[PDB]
Amino acid sequence: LPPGWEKRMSNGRVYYFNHITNASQWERPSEPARVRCSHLLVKHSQSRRPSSWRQEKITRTKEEALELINGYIQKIKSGEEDFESLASQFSDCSSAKARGDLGAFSRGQMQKPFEDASFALRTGEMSGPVFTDSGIHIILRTE
Secondary structure (H helix, E strand, C coil): CCCEEEEEEEECCEEEECCCCEEEEECCCCCCEEEEEEEEECCCCCCCCCCCEECCCCCHHHHHHHHHHHHHHHHHHHCCCCCCHHHHHCCCCCHHHHHHHEEECCCCCCCHHHHHHHHHHHCCCCCEEEEECCCCEEEEEEE
């Protein structure tokens, strides 16, 4: 299995988990010097900057932020909503203006957990919930 991936079991059901991106999937999954990623961020009261373009004062708890993230992940995987659309609407990051696109970056430029998840993703792959000082993210590697 690729880097970070391991075969796991959840309620008698076998699935695959990536310890670096926190991504979980039913399908068997089988580094770049720079990657391009988009992201959807959900901040909470403990974010370093508990404020965003969509909310003067972020008051949701981290637990609530995680629930929202899991909801966005589920809707994207179901196919009822696309990452782009959700990011432009609910991301607490100003990159929402660019449909969540962050452009290209190298290691040492983003917060460590976001960076590690980003470089462990293969092109087109989406991470699971990723935690940083900014809040909780869903990351999509586009390049």
